[PDB]
Amino acid sequence: AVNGKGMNPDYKAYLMAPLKKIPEVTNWETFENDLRWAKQNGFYAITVDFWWGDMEKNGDQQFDFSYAQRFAQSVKNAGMKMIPIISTHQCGGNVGDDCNVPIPSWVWNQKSDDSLYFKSETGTVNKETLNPLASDVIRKEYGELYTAFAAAMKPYKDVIAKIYLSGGPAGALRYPSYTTSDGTGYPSRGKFQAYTEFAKSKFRLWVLNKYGSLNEVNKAWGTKLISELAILPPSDGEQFLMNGYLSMYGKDYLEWYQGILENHTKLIGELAHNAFDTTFQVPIGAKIAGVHWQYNNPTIPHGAEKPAGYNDYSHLLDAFKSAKLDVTFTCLEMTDKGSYPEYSMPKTLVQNIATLANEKGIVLNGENALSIGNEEEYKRVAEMAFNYNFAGFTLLRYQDVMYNNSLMGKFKDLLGVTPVMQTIVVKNVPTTIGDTVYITGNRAELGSWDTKQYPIQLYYDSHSNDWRGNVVLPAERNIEFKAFIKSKDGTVKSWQTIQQSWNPVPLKTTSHTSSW
Ligand SMILES: OC[C@H]1O[C@H](O[C@H]2[C@H](O)[C@@H](O)[C@@H](O[C@H]3[C@H](O)[C@@H](O)[C@@H](O[C@H]4[C@H](O)[C@@H](O)[C@@H](O[C@H]5[C@H](O)[C@@H](O)[C@H](O)O[C@@H]5CO)O[C@@H]4CO)O[C@@H]3CO)O[C@@H]2CO)[C@H](O)[C@@H](O)[C@@H]1O
Ligand SMILES: OC[C@H]1O[C@H](O[C@H]2[C@H](O)[C@@H](O)[C@@H](O[C@H]3[C@H](O)[C@@H](O)[C@@H](O[C@H]4[C@H](O)[C@@H](O)[C@@H](O)O[C@@H]4CO)O[C@@H]3CO)O[C@@H]2CO)[C@H](O)[C@@H](O)[C@@H]1O
Ligand SMILES: OC[C@H]1O[C@H](O[C@H]2[C@H](O)[C@@H](O)[C@@H](O[C@H]3[C@H](O)[C@@H](O)[C@@H](O)O[C@@H]3CO)O[C@@H]2CO)[C@H](O)[C@@H](O)[C@@H]1O
Ligand SMILES: OC[C@H]1O[C@H](O[C@H]2[C@H](O)[C@@H](O)[C@@H](O)O[C@@H]2CO)[C@H](O)[C@@H](O)[C@@H]1O
Ligand SMILES: [Ca+2]
C-alpha cells in the first residue's frame, strides 16, 4: 500500500441488502440461505435500510419496528451479522432507488415556517430529509427514534455488528444539490440549497455574530452592503462558483454552509451514542457521498461538490472524528476521466479522502457507487481498498452477486478475503549504505507490481543479516511477489532473482523465507 504499508488487518467485506423489504423480494427461508452463501463467500455482515417512513408512519411516537425485528430474527437464524441503517431519509428519486418511502409526512407539520425543508437557488423545494439547520426538531425526532429503536432491538444485540446513521439525502451527510426537478442531476453543476427564508436568516445571523456589525462585515469582506438584508447567500450560483468563492465573502459563506453539516454530524453522533452505546456498544458511522463530477472544471472548480456542501474535506472529516463516527466513502470502483463535459475525477477524490482519514486516525470504510457487472471493477475496488488502508468494503447491492454465481466467485476471490499476518524473510540481499528493501506482488494486497507508490517495506535484521517484515496478506489466495531495492533517492536499483509465490497464503500465521 501507500507509505510502505499493507492492507488493513481489520478489513471486512459487507453486503448491502435490497432497498425493499425482503418479503417483497424473496421468502425468509431463502433469505437465510442467501446469507449463509454470502458468508461462505467472505461477507462478514449485511447492511440494511430501516426506513423512517416505515418505523414512525402513523404519527409522532407511533412506532413500528416489526419488520426490523423479523429481519434480525432471520439474520440470527442464519448465524450472520447485520448493520442497521437508521434511514431518516426518503427512499426514491436517487440513483439506483426502486422504492418510494418518504419520511413520515406528519413531520412537516411540526413547524409553520420553512425551517424544515430545502429550497434551491431557483426555488426548488426538497423534502427528502429534514433541513439540518432545524437542530431543535432533529434533536427531538432523531433522539426519540434512536431511543425507541434501541429498546425494540435490544434482544438482537448479539447480531448487530455496527450502526449507520443517515446524515442527509440517499443516506449521506450532504445537501440535495443534484436532483432532476432542480435540473441539477449528474453531470450538471449543483445548486446551493440555502434559499428558504429560515436559511437566509440563519446565514445573516451567523455573519453578524462573527463580525458584530454590518460595518465590520463590509470591512472584512471589502464590500459596500447598504443594510443587513443585503447579507445573503449567492444570488448567482454560476458566478459564485466561477470567482465568488475566492473572496473573503465566499470563504465565509462556504464556512457557514459546510459548517451546518459539521454541526449536524456532531449532533446525530451525540444522539446515536447516547441511544446505542449502553445497549449495543458497537461502532457508529455516517456516510459521505462521492461527488466526482465537475471536479476539475476550469470554469467552475469543484462545481458539484461545493453546492453539495463539500468545500474542505479535512475540516469535514474533523467533525466525524469529534463525533466519534466512522466514515464511509464511495466510488471506489471508478477511474479518473477529468474530461469535458463531466470533468470526473472519482479516483483522485477517493485517494484524497483516504489520505485525510488515515492521517486523522479515522476508521475508513468504502462502497461502490454503481452496480458492478465485471471483474475489472472489482480489481479497481481492490486497488483502492487494500492500498489506502480501508477497514471495510460494502458491495452495492445484494441481487448483483446473489443471482450471479460467476460474479459472486470473482468477488470472493478479489474482495471476500480474510486478512492474515505473515512474516516475509529475504536473504542475501546486496544492499549498500542508504538502500531500502520492499516487496511488491500481483494482487492488489501487494500493490500489483507497483514500486513507486504501493510497495511494502522490509527491515534489515542485523542479527541474521537478512531483511524481514510482518505483512498482512489475503488468506487462502495464491500470490506471486518479488523483493527489490531502492537507493537513497528512491530509484529502483535491482530485483530479486526468482519470482516468489505462495500457493496459497496459509490460513495460519507463519513465515515465507526466500533468497535474493
Ligand atoms: O442502502 C444504502 C443506500 O443506498 C443508496 O444510496 C447509495 C447510492 O446508491 C450510491 O450511489 C452512493 O451515493 C452517491 C454516490 O456516491 C455518488 O457518486 C453519486 O452517484 C452518481 C454517480 O457516481 C454518477 O455516475 C451518476 O450516475 C449515473 C450513471 O453514471 C449512469 O450510468 C446511470 O444511467 O444514471 C446514474 C444517475 O444519473 O450520477 C450519480 C448521482 O445521481 O450520488 C449518489 C447519491 O447520493 O452511496 C449511497 C449510500 O450507500 C440509496 O439511495 C439510499 O437510500 C440507501 O440508504
Ligand atoms: O452577502 C453579500 C452579497 O453576497 C453575494 O454576492 C457575492 C457573489 O455571490 C460572489 O460571486 C461575488 O460576486 C462577484 C461576481 O461573482 C463577479 O462575477 C464580479 O461581479 C460583477 C457582475 O458580473 C456585474 O454584473 C455587476 O454586478 O458588477 C459586479 C462587480 O464587478 O464581481 C462580484 C463582486 O466581486 O461577491 C459578491 C459579494 O461581494 C450575493 O449575490 C449578494 O446578493 C449579497 O448582497
Ligand atoms: O502489469 C501486468 C504484468 O504483470 C506481470 O509482470 C510483473 C512481473 O511478474 C514481476 O516480476 C515484475 O517484473 C520485473 C522483474 O521481476 C524484474 O526482474 C525486472 O525485469 O523488472 C521487471 C519489471 O517490473 O513486475 C511485472 C509488472 O511490472 C506479468 O508477468 C506481465 O506479463 C504482465 O504484463
Ligand atoms: O468549462 C467548460 C464549461 O463549464 C461549465 O459548463 C458545465 C455546466 O455548468 C454543467 O451544468 C454541465 O452542463 O456541464 C457543462 C460542461 O462542463 C460552464 O457553465 C461553461 O460556461 C463552461 O464553458
Ligand atoms: Ca418522535
Side-chain angles (χ1 to χ4, degrees), residues 113-121 123-126 131 133 192-204 232-233 256:
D113 58 9
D114 64 5
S115 69
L116 266 38
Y117 54 88
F118 300 93
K119 179 182 280 189
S120 82
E121 297 174 27
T124 309
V125 178
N126 185 282
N131 188 316
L133 275 177
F192 290 91
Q193 303 292 310
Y195 301 83
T196 44
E197 292 306 310
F198 190 67
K200 296 189 293 192
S201 170
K202 281 292 183 162
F203 174 52
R204 182 172 300 119
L232 300 155
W256 173 79

PDB file of all heavy atoms in Angstrom, residues 113-121 123-126 131 133 192-204 232-233 256:
ATOM      1  N   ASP A 113     -43.204  27.574   9.601  1.00  0.00           N
ATOM      2  CA  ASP A 113     -42.304  28.370   8.767  1.00  0.00           C
ATOM      3  C   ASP A 113     -41.710  27.437   7.707  1.00  0.00           C
ATOM      4  O   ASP A 113     -42.306  26.408   7.392  1.00  0.00           O
ATOM      5  CB  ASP A 113     -41.193  29.014   9.622  1.00  0.00           C
ATOM      6  CG  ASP A 113     -40.371  27.995  10.398  1.00  0.00           C
ATOM      7  OD1 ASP A 113     -40.531  26.783  10.165  1.00  0.00           O
ATOM      8  OD2 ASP A 113     -39.555  28.419  11.248  1.00  0.00           O
ATOM      9  N   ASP A 114     -40.562  27.791   7.135  1.00  0.00           N
ATOM     10  CA  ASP A 114     -39.950  26.925   6.126  1.00  0.00           C
ATOM     11  C   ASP A 114     -38.603  26.389   6.616  1.00  0.00           C
ATOM     12  O   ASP A 114     -37.739  26.012   5.823  1.00  0.00           O
ATOM     13  CB  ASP A 114     -39.773  27.673   4.793  1.00  0.00           C
ATOM     14  CG  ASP A 114     -38.807  28.842   4.887  1.00  0.00           C
ATOM     15  OD1 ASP A 114     -38.195  29.036   5.952  1.00  0.00           O
ATOM     16  OD2 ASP A 114     -38.652  29.570   3.887  1.00  0.00           O
ATOM     17  N   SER A 115     -38.443  26.336   7.931  1.00  0.00           N
ATOM     18  CA  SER A 115     -37.204  25.869   8.531  1.00  0.00           C
ATOM     19  C   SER A 115     -36.905  24.388   8.306  1.00  0.00           C
ATOM     20  O   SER A 115     -35.745  23.983   8.312  1.00  0.00           O
ATOM     21  CB  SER A 115     -37.223  26.144  10.037  1.00  0.00           C
ATOM     22  OG  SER A 115     -38.172  25.322  10.695  1.00  0.00           O
ATOM     23  N   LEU A 116     -37.947  23.589   8.093  1.00  0.00           N
ATOM     24  CA  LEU A 116     -37.783  22.151   7.928  1.00  0.00           C
ATOM     25  C   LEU A 116     -37.267  21.608   6.597  1.00  0.00           C
ATOM     26  O   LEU A 116     -36.582  20.593   6.584  1.00  0.00           O
ATOM     27  CB  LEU A 116     -39.098  21.443   8.301  1.00  0.00           C
ATOM     28  CG  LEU A 116     -39.240  20.936   9.746  1.00  0.00           C
ATOM     29  CD1 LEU A 116     -38.619  21.918  10.718  1.00  0.00           C
ATOM     30  CD2 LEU A 116     -40.711  20.694  10.081  1.00  0.00           C
ATOM     31  N   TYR A 117     -37.575  22.263   5.485  1.00  0.00           N
ATOM     32  CA  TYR A 117     -37.129  21.758   4.187  1.00  0.00           C
ATOM     33  C   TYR A 117     -36.043  22.580   3.494  1.00  0.00           C
ATOM     34  O   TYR A 117     -35.491  23.514   4.068  1.00  0.00           O
ATOM     35  CB  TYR A 117     -38.337  21.578   3.257  1.00  0.00           C
ATOM     36  CG  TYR A 117     -39.203  22.809   3.111  1.00  0.00           C
ATOM     37  CD1 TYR A 117     -38.927  23.774   2.139  1.00  0.00           C
ATOM     38  CD2 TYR A 117     -40.300  23.010   3.946  1.00  0.00           C
ATOM     39  CE1 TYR A 117     -39.732  24.912   2.003  1.00  0.00           C
ATOM     40  CE2 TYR A 117     -41.101  24.135   3.823  1.00  0.00           C
ATOM     41  CZ  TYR A 117     -40.816  25.082   2.852  1.00  0.00           C
ATOM     42  OH  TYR A 117     -41.615  26.191   2.741  1.00  0.00           O
ATOM     43  N   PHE A 118     -35.739  22.217   2.254  1.00  0.00           N
ATOM     44  CA  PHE A 118     -34.707  22.901   1.485  1.00  0.00           C
ATOM     45  C   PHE A 118     -35.322  23.653   0.312  1.00  0.00           C
ATOM     46  O   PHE A 118     -36.408  23.310  -0.153  1.00  0.00           O
ATOM     47  CB  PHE A 118     -33.702  21.885   0.922  1.00  0.00           C
ATOM     48  CG  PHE A 118     -32.983  21.079   1.969  1.00  0.00           C
ATOM     49  CD1 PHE A 118     -33.479  19.844   2.376  1.00  0.00           C
ATOM     50  CD2 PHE A 118     -31.794  21.540   2.530  1.00  0.00           C
ATOM     51  CE1 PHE A 118     -32.796  19.072   3.331  1.00  0.00           C
ATOM     52  CE2 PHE A 118     -31.106  20.777   3.482  1.00  0.00           C
ATOM     53  CZ  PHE A 118     -31.612  19.538   3.880  1.00  0.00           C
ATOM     54  N   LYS A 119     -34.620  24.684  -0.152  1.00  0.00           N
ATOM     55  CA  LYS A 119     -35.042  25.470  -1.309  1.00  0.00           C
ATOM     56  C   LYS A 119     -33.776  25.896  -2.065  1.00  0.00           C
ATOM     57  O   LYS A 119     -32.871  26.504  -1.487  1.00  0.00           O
ATOM     58  CB  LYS A 119     -35.841  26.704  -0.893  1.00  0.00           C
ATOM     59  CG  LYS A 119     -36.257  27.547  -2.088  1.00  0.00           C
ATOM     60  CD  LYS A 119     -37.024  28.806  -1.698  1.00  0.00           C
ATOM     61  CE  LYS A 119     -38.480  28.529  -1.386  1.00  0.00           C
ATOM     62  NZ  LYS A 119     -39.208  29.827  -1.239  1.00  0.00           N
ATOM     63  N   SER A 120     -33.726  25.577  -3.355  1.00  0.00           N
ATOM     64  CA  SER A 120     -32.563  25.882  -4.188  1.00  0.00           C
ATOM     65  C   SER A 120     -32.471  27.307  -4.726  1.00  0.00           C
ATOM     66  O   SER A 120     -33.385  28.120  -4.573  1.00  0.00           O
ATOM     67  CB  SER A 120     -32.527  24.943  -5.385  1.00  0.00           C
ATOM     68  OG  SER A 120     -33.400  25.429  -6.393  1.00  0.00           O
ATOM     69  N   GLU A 121     -31.345  27.575  -5.383  1.00  0.00           N
ATOM     70  CA  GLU A 121     -31.069  28.863  -6.000  1.00  0.00           C
ATOM     71  C   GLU A 121     -32.258  29.301  -6.849  1.00  0.00           C
ATOM     72  O   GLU A 121     -32.559  30.494  -6.936  1.00  0.00           O
ATOM     73  CB  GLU A 121     -29.839  28.757  -6.908  1.00  0.00           C
ATOM     74  CG  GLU A 121     -28.533  28.399  -6.213  1.00  0.00           C
ATOM     75  CD  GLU A 121     -27.399  28.173  -7.200  1.00  0.00           C
ATOM     76  OE1 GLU A 121     -27.443  28.763  -8.300  1.00  0.00           O
ATOM     77  OE2 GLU A 121     -26.458  27.420  -6.881  1.00  0.00           O
ATOM     78  N   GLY A 123     -35.469  28.134  -6.405  1.00  0.00           N
ATOM     79  CA  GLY A 123     -36.740  27.925  -5.727  1.00  0.00           C
ATOM     80  C   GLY A 123     -37.271  26.508  -5.599  1.00  0.00           C
ATOM     81  O   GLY A 123     -38.368  26.307  -5.065  1.00  0.00           O
ATOM     82  N   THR A 124     -36.511  25.526  -6.071  1.00  0.00           N
ATOM     83  CA  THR A 124     -36.944  24.132  -5.996  1.00  0.00           C
ATOM     84  C   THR A 124     -36.960  23.632  -4.557  1.00  0.00           C
ATOM     85  O   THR A 124     -35.949  23.687  -3.862  1.00  0.00           O
ATOM     86  CB  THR A 124     -36.025  23.221  -6.830  1.00  0.00           C
ATOM     87  OG1 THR A 124     -35.902  23.755  -8.151  1.00  0.00           O
ATOM     88  CG2 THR A 124     -36.610  21.809  -6.917  1.00  0.00           C
ATOM     89  N   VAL A 125     -38.122  23.148  -4.119  1.00  0.00           N
ATOM     90  CA  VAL A 125     -38.300  22.630  -2.763  1.00  0.00           C
ATOM     91  C   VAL A 125     -37.919  21.154  -2.674  1.00  0.00           C
ATOM     92  O   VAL A 125     -38.307  20.362  -3.527  1.00  0.00           O
ATOM     93  CB  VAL A 125     -39.774  22.762  -2.309  1.00  0.00           C
ATOM     94  CG1 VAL A 125     -39.950  22.167  -0.918  1.00  0.00           C
ATOM     95  CG2 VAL A 125     -40.197  24.218  -2.334  1.00  0.00           C
ATOM     96  N   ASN A 126     -37.166  20.788  -1.637  1.00  0.00           N
ATOM     97  CA  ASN A 126     -36.756  19.399  -1.441  1.00  0.00           C
ATOM     98  C   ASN A 126     -37.161  18.943  -0.043  1.00  0.00           C
ATOM     99  O   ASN A 126     -36.871  19.623   0.938  1.00  0.00           O
ATOM    100  CB  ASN A 126     -35.237  19.252  -1.626  1.00  0.00           C
ATOM    101  CG  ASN A 126     -34.775  17.803  -1.556  1.00  0.00           C
ATOM    102  OD1 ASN A 126     -34.662  17.229  -0.474  1.00  0.00           O
ATOM    103  ND2 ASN A 126     -34.526  17.199  -2.714  1.00  0.00           N
ATOM    104  N   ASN A 131     -34.097  19.560   7.086  1.00  0.00           N
ATOM    105  CA  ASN A 131     -33.000  20.505   6.930  1.00  0.00           C
ATOM    106  C   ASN A 131     -32.187  20.531   8.232  1.00  0.00           C
ATOM    107  O   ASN A 131     -32.724  20.824   9.301  1.00  0.00           O
ATOM    108  CB  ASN A 131     -33.558  21.896   6.635  1.00  0.00           C
ATOM    109  CG  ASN A 131     -32.481  22.886   6.273  1.00  0.00           C
ATOM    110  OD1 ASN A 131     -31.436  22.936   6.914  1.00  0.00           O
ATOM    111  ND2 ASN A 131     -32.731  23.687   5.247  1.00  0.00           N
ATOM    112  N   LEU A 133     -30.418  22.623   9.563  1.00  0.00           N
ATOM    113  CA  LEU A 133     -30.454  23.894  10.293  1.00  0.00           C
ATOM    114  C   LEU A 133     -31.464  23.833  11.432  1.00  0.00           C
ATOM    115  O   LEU A 133     -31.317  24.527  12.434  1.00  0.00           O
ATOM    116  CB  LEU A 133     -30.833  25.058   9.370  1.00  0.00           C
ATOM    117  CG  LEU A 133     -29.735  25.747   8.557  1.00  0.00           C
ATOM    118  CD1 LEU A 133     -30.366  26.820   7.674  1.00  0.00           C
ATOM    119  CD2 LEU A 133     -28.704  26.369   9.497  1.00  0.00           C
ATOM    120  N   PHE A 192     -26.815  25.534  -4.914  1.00  0.00           N
ATOM    121  CA  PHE A 192     -26.793  25.641  -3.462  1.00  0.00           C
ATOM    122  C   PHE A 192     -28.227  25.491  -2.964  1.00  0.00           C
ATOM    123  O   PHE A 192     -29.176  25.874  -3.653  1.00  0.00           O
ATOM    124  CB  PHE A 192     -26.190  26.981  -3.013  1.00  0.00           C
ATOM    125  CG  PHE A 192     -24.714  27.091  -3.273  1.00  0.00           C
ATOM    126  CD1 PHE A 192     -24.239  27.621  -4.467  1.00  0.00           C
ATOM    127  CD2 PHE A 192     -23.798  26.614  -2.343  1.00  0.00           C
ATOM    128  CE1 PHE A 192     -22.866  27.675  -4.732  1.00  0.00           C
ATOM    129  CE2 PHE A 192     -22.429  26.661  -2.598  1.00  0.00           C
ATOM    130  CZ  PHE A 192     -21.962  27.195  -3.799  1.00  0.00           C
ATOM    131  N   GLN A 193     -28.374  24.929  -1.772  1.00  0.00           N
ATOM    132  CA  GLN A 193     -29.681  24.680  -1.179  1.00  0.00           C
ATOM    133  C   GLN A 193     -29.884  25.492   0.095  1.00  0.00           C
ATOM    134  O   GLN A 193     -30.238  24.942   1.136  1.00  0.00           O
ATOM    135  CB  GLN A 193     -29.811  23.183  -0.856  1.00  0.00           C
ATOM    136  CG  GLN A 193     -29.602  22.252  -2.046  1.00  0.00           C
ATOM    137  CD  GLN A 193     -30.709  22.367  -3.080  1.00  0.00           C
ATOM    138  OE1 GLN A 193     -31.891  22.309  -2.745  1.00  0.00           O
ATOM    139  NE2 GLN A 193     -30.332  22.520  -4.343  1.00  0.00           N
ATOM    140  N   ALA A 194     -29.676  26.801   0.014  1.00  0.00           N
ATOM    141  CA  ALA A 194     -29.817  27.657   1.189  1.00  0.00           C
ATOM    142  C   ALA A 194     -30.692  28.876   0.926  1.00  0.00           C
ATOM    143  O   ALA A 194     -30.359  29.979   1.357  1.00  0.00           O
ATOM    144  CB  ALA A 194     -28.441  28.110   1.646  1.00  0.00           C
ATOM    145  N   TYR A 195     -31.822  28.681   0.253  1.00  0.00           N
ATOM    146  CA  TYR A 195     -32.676  29.814  -0.074  1.00  0.00           C
ATOM    147  C   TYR A 195     -34.053  29.904   0.582  1.00  0.00           C
ATOM    148  O   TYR A 195     -34.910  30.667   0.138  1.00  0.00           O
ATOM    149  CB  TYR A 195     -32.768  29.927  -1.598  1.00  0.00           C
ATOM    150  CG  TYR A 195     -31.394  30.128  -2.197  1.00  0.00           C
ATOM    151  CD1 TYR A 195     -30.553  29.040  -2.433  1.00  0.00           C
ATOM    152  CD2 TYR A 195     -30.891  31.411  -2.430  1.00  0.00           C
ATOM    153  CE1 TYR A 195     -29.253  29.218  -2.870  1.00  0.00           C
ATOM    154  CE2 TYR A 195     -29.590  31.602  -2.871  1.00  0.00           C
ATOM    155  CZ  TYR A 195     -28.774  30.503  -3.084  1.00  0.00           C
ATOM    156  OH  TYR A 195     -27.469  30.682  -3.475  1.00  0.00           O
ATOM    157  N   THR A 196     -34.276  29.121   1.632  1.00  0.00           N
ATOM    158  CA  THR A 196     -35.533  29.233   2.361  1.00  0.00           C
ATOM    159  C   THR A 196     -35.311  30.509   3.176  1.00  0.00           C
ATOM    160  O   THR A 196     -34.171  30.965   3.306  1.00  0.00           O
ATOM    161  CB  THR A 196     -35.760  28.052   3.329  1.00  0.00           C
ATOM    162  OG1 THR A 196     -34.547  27.770   4.035  1.00  0.00           O
ATOM    163  CG2 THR A 196     -36.222  26.814   2.567  1.00  0.00           C
ATOM    164  N   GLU A 197     -36.375  31.095   3.709  1.00  0.00           N
ATOM    165  CA  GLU A 197     -36.220  32.316   4.497  1.00  0.00           C
ATOM    166  C   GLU A 197     -35.458  32.019   5.788  1.00  0.00           C
ATOM    167  O   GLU A 197     -34.667  32.838   6.260  1.00  0.00           O
ATOM    168  CB  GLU A 197     -37.586  32.932   4.808  1.00  0.00           C
ATOM    169  CG  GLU A 197     -38.301  33.493   3.584  1.00  0.00           C
ATOM    170  CD  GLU A 197     -37.449  34.495   2.812  1.00  0.00           C
ATOM    171  OE1 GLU A 197     -36.906  35.434   3.436  1.00  0.00           O
ATOM    172  OE2 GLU A 197     -37.322  34.353   1.575  1.00  0.00           O
ATOM    173  N   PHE A 198     -35.694  30.838   6.349  1.00  0.00           N
ATOM    174  CA  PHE A 198     -35.011  30.432   7.568  1.00  0.00           C
ATOM    175  C   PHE A 198     -33.494  30.369   7.319  1.00  0.00           C
ATOM    176  O   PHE A 198     -32.714  30.897   8.103  1.00  0.00           O
ATOM    177  CB  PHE A 198     -35.536  29.068   8.019  1.00  0.00           C
ATOM    178  CG  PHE A 198     -35.071  28.657   9.383  1.00  0.00           C
ATOM    179  CD1 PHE A 198     -35.490  29.353  10.516  1.00  0.00           C
ATOM    180  CD2 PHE A 198     -34.227  27.561   9.542  1.00  0.00           C
ATOM    181  CE1 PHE A 198     -35.074  28.959  11.787  1.00  0.00           C
ATOM    182  CE2 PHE A 198     -33.806  27.159  10.810  1.00  0.00           C
ATOM    183  CZ  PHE A 198     -34.230  27.858  11.933  1.00  0.00           C
ATOM    184  N   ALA A 199     -33.084  29.733   6.220  1.00  0.00           N
ATOM    185  CA  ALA A 199     -31.660  29.610   5.876  1.00  0.00           C
ATOM    186  C   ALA A 199     -30.991  30.974   5.682  1.00  0.00           C
ATOM    187  O   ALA A 199     -29.885  31.210   6.173  1.00  0.00           O
ATOM    188  CB  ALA A 199     -31.490  28.769   4.611  1.00  0.00           C
ATOM    189  N   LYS A 200     -31.654  31.870   4.959  1.00  0.00           N
ATOM    190  CA  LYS A 200     -31.091  33.195   4.737  1.00  0.00           C
ATOM    191  C   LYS A 200     -30.979  33.943   6.067  1.00  0.00           C
ATOM    192  O   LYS A 200     -29.981  34.607   6.340  1.00  0.00           O
ATOM    193  CB  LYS A 200     -31.950  33.968   3.731  1.00  0.00           C
ATOM    194  CG  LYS A 200     -31.958  33.304   2.358  1.00  0.00           C
ATOM    195  CD  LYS A 200     -32.609  34.152   1.279  1.00  0.00           C
ATOM    196  CE  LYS A 200     -34.095  34.330   1.516  1.00  0.00           C
ATOM    197  NZ  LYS A 200     -34.762  34.904   0.309  1.00  0.00           N
ATOM    198  N   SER A 201     -31.999  33.808   6.905  1.00  0.00           N
ATOM    199  CA  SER A 201     -31.990  34.461   8.205  1.00  0.00           C
ATOM    200  C   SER A 201     -30.825  33.938   9.037  1.00  0.00           C
ATOM    201  O   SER A 201     -30.113  34.711   9.683  1.00  0.00           O
ATOM    202  CB  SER A 201     -33.309  34.200   8.931  1.00  0.00           C
ATOM    203  OG  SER A 201     -33.240  34.619  10.279  1.00  0.00           O
ATOM    204  N   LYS A 202     -30.627  32.621   9.001  1.00  0.00           N
ATOM    205  CA  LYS A 202     -29.551  31.978   9.748  1.00  0.00           C
ATOM    206  C   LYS A 202     -28.162  32.403   9.280  1.00  0.00           C
ATOM    207  O   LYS A 202     -27.278  32.635  10.101  1.00  0.00           O
ATOM    208  CB  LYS A 202     -29.689  30.455   9.662  1.00  0.00           C
ATOM    209  CG  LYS A 202     -30.750  29.886  10.598  1.00  0.00           C
ATOM    210  CD  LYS A 202     -30.313  30.055  12.050  1.00  0.00           C
ATOM    211  CE  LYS A 202     -31.300  29.436  13.013  1.00  0.00           C
ATOM    212  NZ  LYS A 202     -30.668  29.228  14.355  1.00  0.00           N
ATOM    213  N   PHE A 203     -27.959  32.502   7.969  1.00  0.00           N
ATOM    214  CA  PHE A 203     -26.653  32.920   7.459  1.00  0.00           C
ATOM    215  C   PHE A 203     -26.375  34.359   7.902  1.00  0.00           C
ATOM    216  O   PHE A 203     -25.259  34.694   8.309  1.00  0.00           O
ATOM    217  CB  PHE A 203     -26.608  32.829   5.930  1.00  0.00           C
ATOM    218  CG  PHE A 203     -25.340  33.384   5.329  1.00  0.00           C
ATOM    219  CD1 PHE A 203     -24.095  32.958   5.788  1.00  0.00           C
ATOM    220  CD2 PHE A 203     -25.391  34.341   4.317  1.00  0.00           C
ATOM    221  CE1 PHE A 203     -22.924  33.479   5.255  1.00  0.00           C
ATOM    222  CE2 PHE A 203     -24.222  34.870   3.773  1.00  0.00           C
ATOM    223  CZ  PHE A 203     -22.985  34.440   4.244  1.00  0.00           C
ATOM    224  N   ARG A 204     -27.410  35.194   7.827  1.00  0.00           N
ATOM    225  CA  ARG A 204     -27.323  36.598   8.220  1.00  0.00           C
ATOM    226  C   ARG A 204     -26.928  36.725   9.696  1.00  0.00           C
ATOM    227  O   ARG A 204     -26.032  37.491  10.042  1.00  0.00           O
ATOM    228  CB  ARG A 204     -28.674  37.282   7.965  1.00  0.00           C
ATOM    229  CG  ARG A 204     -28.728  38.770   8.281  1.00  0.00           C
ATOM    230  CD  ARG A 204     -30.050  39.387   7.801  1.00  0.00           C
ATOM    231  NE  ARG A 204     -30.199  39.236   6.356  1.00  0.00           N
ATOM    232  CZ  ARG A 204     -31.182  38.566   5.765  1.00  0.00           C
ATOM    233  NH1 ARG A 204     -32.130  37.983   6.489  1.00  0.00           N
ATOM    234  NH2 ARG A 204     -31.201  38.450   4.445  1.00  0.00           N
ATOM    235  N   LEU A 232     -26.650  38.045   2.093  1.00  0.00           N
ATOM    236  CA  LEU A 232     -27.402  36.914   1.556  1.00  0.00           C
ATOM    237  C   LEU A 232     -26.505  35.863   0.923  1.00  0.00           C
ATOM    238  O   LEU A 232     -25.320  36.097   0.690  1.00  0.00           O
ATOM    239  CB  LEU A 232     -28.354  37.412   0.467  1.00  0.00           C
ATOM    240  CG  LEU A 232     -29.439  38.440   0.791  1.00  0.00           C
ATOM    241  CD1 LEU A 232     -29.813  39.196  -0.470  1.00  0.00           C
ATOM    242  CD2 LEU A 232     -30.649  37.740   1.382  1.00  0.00           C
ATOM    243  N   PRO A 233     -27.067  34.674   0.652  1.00  0.00           N
ATOM    244  CA  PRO A 233     -26.288  33.604   0.019  1.00  0.00           C
ATOM    245  C   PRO A 233     -26.109  34.043  -1.442  1.00  0.00           C
ATOM    246  O   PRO A 233     -26.723  35.018  -1.869  1.00  0.00           O
ATOM    247  CB  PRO A 233     -27.193  32.377   0.176  1.00  0.00           C
ATOM    248  CG  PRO A 233     -28.573  32.972   0.223  1.00  0.00           C
ATOM    249  CD  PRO A 233     -28.381  34.179   1.098  1.00  0.00           C
ATOM    250  N   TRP A 256     -19.860  28.708   6.611  1.00  0.00           N
ATOM    251  CA  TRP A 256     -21.182  28.567   7.217  1.00  0.00           C
ATOM    252  C   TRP A 256     -21.929  27.371   6.620  1.00  0.00           C
ATOM    253  O   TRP A 256     -22.480  26.540   7.343  1.00  0.00           O
ATOM    254  CB  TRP A 256     -22.005  29.840   6.978  1.00  0.00           C
ATOM    255  CG  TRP A 256     -23.452  29.735   7.412  1.00  0.00           C
ATOM    256  CD1 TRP A 256     -23.944  29.843   8.688  1.00  0.00           C
ATOM    257  CD2 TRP A 256     -24.585  29.509   6.565  1.00  0.00           C
ATOM    258  NE1 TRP A 256     -25.315  29.704   8.683  1.00  0.00           N
ATOM    259  CE2 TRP A 256     -25.734  29.498   7.394  1.00  0.00           C
ATOM    260  CE3 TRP A 256     -24.741  29.315   5.185  1.00  0.00           C
ATOM    261  CZ2 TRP A 256     -27.023  29.305   6.887  1.00  0.00           C
ATOM    262  CZ3 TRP A 256     -26.024  29.121   4.679  1.00  0.00           C
ATOM    263  CH2 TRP A 256     -27.150  29.118   5.532  1.00  0.00           C
TER     264      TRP A 256
END
